[PDB]
Design an enzyme around this catalytic site. Structure first.
Site, PDB file in Angstrom:
ATOM      1  N   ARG A 125       0.870  -1.621  -0.051  1.00 13.88           N
ATOM      2  CA  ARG A 125       0.372  -0.333   0.225  1.00 13.88           C
ATOM      3  C   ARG A 125       0.823   1.179   0.449  1.00 13.88           C
ATOM      4  O   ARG A 125       0.114   2.710   0.183  1.00 13.88           O
ATOM      5  CB  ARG A 125      -1.002  -0.362   0.972  1.00 13.88           C
TER       6      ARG A 125
HETATM    7  C1  LIG Z   1      -3.930   5.461  -1.886  1.00 14.34           C
HETATM    8  C2  LIG Z   1      -5.196   4.687  -1.292  1.00 14.34           C
HETATM    9  N1  LIG Z   1      -6.606   4.451  -0.034  1.00 14.34           N
HETATM   10  C3  LIG Z   1      -7.113   4.149  -0.785  1.00 14.34           C
HETATM   11  C4  LIG Z   1      -7.681   2.327  -1.454  1.00 14.34           C
HETATM   12  C5  LIG Z   1      -8.405   1.965  -1.668  1.00 14.34           C
HETATM   13  O1  LIG Z   1      -9.000   1.811  -0.104  1.00 14.34           O
HETATM   14  P1  LIG Z   1      -9.060   0.632   0.434  1.00 14.34           P
HETATM   15  O2  LIG Z   1      -7.594   0.544   1.163  1.00 14.34           O
HETATM   16  O3  LIG Z   1     -10.575   0.923   2.110  1.00 14.34           O
HETATM   17  O4  LIG Z   1      -9.483  -0.204   0.160  1.00 14.34           O
HETATM   18  C6  LIG Z   1      -5.969   3.038  -2.597  1.00 14.34           C
HETATM   19  C7  LIG Z   1      -6.351   2.048  -3.924  1.00 14.34           C
HETATM   20  O5  LIG Z   1      -5.458   2.001  -4.682  1.00 14.34           O
HETATM   21  C8  LIG Z   1      -5.642   3.515  -2.891  1.00 14.34           C
HETATM   22  O6  LIG Z   1      -3.889   3.654  -3.728  1.00 14.34           O
END
Ligand SMILES: Cc1ncc(COP(=O)(O)O)c(C=O)c1O
Ligand SMILES: Cc1cc2nc3c(=O)[nH]c(=O)nc-3n(C[C@H](O)[C@H](O)[C@H](O)COP(=O)(O)O)c2cc1C
Ligand SMILES: Cc1cc2nc3c(=O)[nH]c(=O)nc-3n(C[C@H](O)[C@H](O)[C@H](O)COP(=O)(O)O)c2cc1C
Ligand SMILES: Cc1ncc(COP(=O)(O)O)c(C=O)c1O
Lengths: 213, 213
Positions: free
Chosen positions: B177
């Site tokens: 992530r």
């Molecule tokens: C910065 C960021 N936040 C959230 C997400 C996706 O949302 P979640 O982790 O709540 O499923 C992504 C998906 O690529 C992301 O890059």
């Protein structure tokens, strides 16, 4: 009637198309969408996001309020969305004002995500300049030990927005190049102000009409 | 050095990533992109388009100037682009001023398209309201007989734009992530005005830095 539609409530028509994309094995993330925002002064920006809930109230998504998109929405709460499903030759566009979701709502959603995702949100001041990728890796490892067995608090700057739809277009591509475009928009004189020869009545205060491709 | 890059010229880095997407059998149209525009007053809009050429001068695409996007670019010549290649977990964002392409250039490009595509551009006053899909089908069939064996002239309202890049971000998704974001922007004090501790020198007047995901 039929102009190939399931519902005259655009949100319900989206639900039918969304379900089909979800049903399609060639689509990885059917809720992946491109969010377009801009400064008050007219400078646009855009990026991919994930839709996290939709209904009559609108289209919901989460991000860091201090991100570049967050600063833009907060100073000029208007946005546009684009869903594109290549295997279906379909495109959905949504335009509307945006509103920040209530804190407790963001809290509940935040803690439903996997732990590593929550910790990721605490390490990253989304869109701020950092020195290198190691900086993130180090900070992340340290926050994992801090929160071992502990609940991760939601950052104050992290939350959601809901975009209330004012315009929604369903684009269905066609081999002959004469794409079908059916666009819904909310009417002002709702109650009974019969309109243009080419403008039709949808559910609630919704009106719809076809647009040349 | 390396922050995983092929070139410090963003346009050349795009070329490397573009070629990879083109090389990928799971990507249908690698040049498909989402174009974000907005009114001067800050009202954004967005839609899918095809990139039709790129180089040092910019990113080129074609559309009808009288379309909703065309009226917006003409009154506020600024735009943003988003390329998203799901199988590669990659995203490319481009921000810059836009300029209309010269007439003769649009002409040459227009006649290189398949005939049916040219005729499609003559029938459709892109984004104007029409009564139904039959209206398009009828008009299209009639223009095919008018142009049988004849050259189709480019509509006056049809053409191209080139967006000269001022900002270009390469987003590489990561399972942990902690996405990699390397963003290029053109510097004002080019010549030699050494900057921030976390800001680096790219080719020409380009500067680059990492952004938190
Ligand atoms: C910065 C960021 N936040 C959230 C997400 C996706 O949302 P979640 O982790 O709540 O499923 C992504 C998906 O690529 C992301 O890059
Ligand atoms: C498919 C996909 C889904 C994404 N989903 C989200 C999301 O829901 N929220 C988010 O903040 N960023 C998400 N991102 C990252 C954004 O595209 C972007 O990098 C980040 O939000 C910073 O954008 P900004 O600098 O314009 O504010 C996603 C990226 C991709 C490729
Ligand atoms: C993959 C894809 C590629 C497209 N390429 C183009 C294009 O190059 N030019 C164009 O005018 N419309 C293109 N369209 C149609 C637009 O998305 C849009 O329907 C049209 O330009 C009218 O947009 P506007 O009403 O915002 O002006 C494409 C659609 C898809 C789904
Ligand atoms: C309205 C419109 N113009 C142009 C294109 C593609 O450009 P071209 O026909 O020159 O390859 C598309 C592709 O979907 C389109 O929908």
């Amino acid at each position: 009637e039929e102009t190939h539609l399931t519902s005259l409530d655009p949100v319900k028509q989206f639900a039918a198309w969304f379900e089909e994309a979800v049903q399609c094995p060639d689509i990885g993330e059917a809720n992946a969408m491109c969010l377009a925002t801009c400064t008050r002064d007219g400078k646009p920006s855009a990026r991919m996001l994930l839709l996290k809930g939709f209904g009559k109230d609108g289209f919901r998504f989460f991000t860091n309020f201090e991100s570049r998109k967050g600063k833009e929405l907060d100073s000029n709460p208007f946005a546009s969305l684009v869903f594109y499903w290549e295997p279906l030759n379909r495109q959905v566009r949504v335009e509307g004002p945006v509103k920040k979701l209530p804190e407790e709502e963001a809290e509940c959603y935040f803690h439903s995500r996997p732990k590593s995702s929550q910790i990721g949100a605490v390490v990253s001041h989304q869109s701020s300049v950092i020195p290198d990728r190691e900086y993130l890796r180090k900070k992340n490892e340290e926050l994992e030990q801090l929160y071992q067995d502990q609940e991760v608090p939601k950052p104050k700057s992290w939350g959601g927005y809901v975009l209330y739809p004012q315009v929604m277009e369903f684009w269905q591509g066609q081999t002959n190049r004469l794409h079908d475009r059916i666009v819904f928009r909310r009417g002002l004189p709702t109650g009974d102000s019969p309109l243009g020869p080419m403008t039709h009545r949808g559910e609630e205060d919704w009106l719809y009409e076809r647009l040349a491709p």
